[PDB]
Ligand binder design. Structure first.
Ligand SMILES: Cc1nn(-c2cc(Cl)cc(-c3ccccc3C(N)=O)c2)c2cc(N[C@@H](C)c3ccccc3)ncc12
Length: 261
């Protein structure tokens, strides 16, 4: 079943030209779509109705949309309206051309300390907006932290997001991200999936002695066994880690392959 070259919706009555392929997410396929009247570029999520044959699966997508649609923040991926034809459900989203923070990680390994400050700050500022509007992401990872042409972090993928465990699970996820950025490897990384959960439950990680004592102190608190003893989003911004060392306000595109100079 072919995805149409031109994507039109009954509501806005706008035409979207399906351009270059971008990737796939389980059952969804992403394409770079262009508004045929305004020439504005968007990331279009295309999901076939055969993937949502069961009404239960149709719930999770409508819940994700309801949460994402209400969101408006310079650090959250912009929602720009969803629609459907009989074959596919289309979600028009903000385009992030420099991929996610995952592709940067795999290419870079351990990033420099000032970079981590920039990336965490912008991510945490986005997480703050979510938590203020009573939204828990619940699945924060490097792949969800998208990057545009200005290297700005934009949080996306709200497939497990909820609106009101609570807020402190997002703090935990951010602790893993800060670890991975600074160390170069995930804190609970193992080839076996079953092992990873035992690693998480027993809280089995060890920050290598090479990491900044101030940075390791923040990571430990973010990954603390007691969820109530984890720092709040507001407390994260003001931590020594951000205030002590150099923190750039802009990063070059070179950071995708090489350390800044
Ligand atoms: C919003 C939104 N969602 N996606 C999106 C949508 C689906 Cl269905 C799949 C994937 C995806 C494909 C392969 C690996 C990983 C992923 C993933 N991050 O889940 C990504 C976007 C993609 C882009 N830019 C392109 C250049 C890009 C391609 C690959 C990775 C990152 C960015 N910009 C905004 C969005």
């Amino acid at each position: 079943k072919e995805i149409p070259d031109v994507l039109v919706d009954p509501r806005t009555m706008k035409r979207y030209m399906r351009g270059r392929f971008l990737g796939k997410g389980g059952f969804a396929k992403c394409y770079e779509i262009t508004d045929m009247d305004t020439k504005e570029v968007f990331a279009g999520k295309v999901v076939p109705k055969s993937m949502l044959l069961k009404p239960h699966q149709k719930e999770k997508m409508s819940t994700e949309i309801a949460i994402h649609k209400s969101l408006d923040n310079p650090h959250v991926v912009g929602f720009h309206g969803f629609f459907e034809d009989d074959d596919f459900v289309y979600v028009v989203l903000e385009i992030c051309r420099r991929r996610s923070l995952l592709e940067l990680h795999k290419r870079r390994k351990a990033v420099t300390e000032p970079e981590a400050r920039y990336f965490m700050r912008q991510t945490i500022q986005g997480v703050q907006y979510l938590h203020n509007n009573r939204v828990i992401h619940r699945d924060l990872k490097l792949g969800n932290l998208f990057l545009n042409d200005d290297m700005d972090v934009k949080i996306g993928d709200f497939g497990l997001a909820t609106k009101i465990h609570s807020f402190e699970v997002d703090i935990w996820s951010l602790g893993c991200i800060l670890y991975t950025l600074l160390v170069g490897k995930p804190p609970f990384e193992t080839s076996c999936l079953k092992e990873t959960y035992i690693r998480i439950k027993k809280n089995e990680y060890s920050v290598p002695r090479h990491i900044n004592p101030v940075a390791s102190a923040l990571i430990r608190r973010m990954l603390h066994a007691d969820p109530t003893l984890r720092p709040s989003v507001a407390e994260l911004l003001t931590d020594e880690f951000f205030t002590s060392g150099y923190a750039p306000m802009r990063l070059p595109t070179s950071c995708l392959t090489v350390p800044p100079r």
